[PDB]
């Protein structure tokens, strides 16, 4: 079929079905935003399979149909303030509130990088990417 296998940041992947006329950006917007990723923080590459390099950067507005049959990869731009969380168990002796549900938080979990504090039953609502501008 007229599909493209695109490897995504953080060891993820998707297979998009190219509609005639769509750009790489049009085909990959939903796959990135559903995974909590911003297209402005990413670049799209063509995986090279010869001795020259490992991949070559492509313009986001490139016609996707012209790359049918090639393997692509989307990576974070250089040094974007996006990383993965570092969760840790944490008992709040002093009164605290959950960042997800705003209720009382006695025994919760806190990310040691961004400070996101939450109940265990609220962890799935924590955003996938950890924003670190420290």
């Amino acid at each position: 079929s007229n599909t493209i296998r695109v490897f995504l940041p953080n060891k993820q992947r998707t297979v998009v079905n190219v509609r005639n006329g769509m750009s790489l950006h049009d085909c990959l917007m939903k796959a990135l935003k559903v995974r909590g990723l911003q297209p402005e923080c990413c670049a799209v590459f063509r995986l090279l399979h010869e001795h020259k390099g490992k991949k070559a950067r492509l313009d986001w507005n490139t016609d996707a149909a012209s790359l049918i049959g090639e393997e692509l990869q989307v990576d974070f731009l250089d040094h974007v303030p996006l990383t993965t969380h570092n969760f840790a168990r944490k008992t709040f002796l002093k009164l605290a509130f959950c960042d997800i549900c705003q209720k009382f938080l006695l025994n919760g979990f806190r990310c040691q990088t961004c400070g996101y504090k939450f109940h265990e039953h609220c962890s799935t609502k924590v955003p996938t990417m950890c924003v670190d501008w420290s």
Partner: protein
């Protein structure tokens, strides 16, 4: 951190993607975008332990490509829609495929009945409970629209993988 490789299987349109995206992004996708191949990674805290869920969202329309991801998978969410008896019976075919690639009757699985928000129910809870009882696996009622039981479905499958590892 322990990584759990999860695979979501089921007939086309039962809500495999809507359940996964509701877990990852906390948003309900109300459009029909038939999946070809989609993998997701997300940290979740389950019973005090943080773990990384590597979820493979598969195609209900089957675009032999299943066997490869069925061999490497650690747990499976066999999903059907409570308003689609055909998908409820299709569950048997998916468990047959998984057992054919795992070479064991003891595979971590969780039967998931989705679309519980709809009043046009054709598969009642007793039926799915009996089917899950027949397979020796848990059963979870979910609704990706209301997020009901979405966490409960994935939390249960992880616990099935933990006890399967002894």
């Amino acid at each position: 951190m322990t990584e759990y490789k999860l695979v979501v299987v089921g007939a086309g349109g039962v809500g495999k993607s809507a359940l996964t995206i509701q877990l990852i992004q906390n948003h309900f996708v109300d459009e029909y975008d038939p999946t070809i191949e989609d993998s997701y990674r997300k940290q979740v805290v389950i019973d005090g332990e943080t773990c990384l869920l590597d979820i493979l969202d598969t195609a209900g329309q089957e675009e032999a490509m299943r066997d490869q991801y069925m061999r490497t998978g650690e747990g499976f969410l066999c999903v059907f829609a409570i308003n689609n008896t055909k998908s409820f019976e299709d569950i048997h075919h998916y468990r047959e495929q998984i057992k054919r690639v795992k070479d064991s009757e003891d595979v971590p699985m969780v039967l998931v009945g989705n679309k519980c928000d709809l009043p046009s129910r054709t598969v009642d809870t007793k039926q799915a409970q009996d089917l899950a009882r027949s397979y020796g696996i848990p059963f979870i009622e979910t609704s990706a629209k209301t997020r009901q039981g979405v966490d409960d479905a994935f939390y249960t499958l992880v616990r099935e993988i933990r006890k399967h590892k002894e």
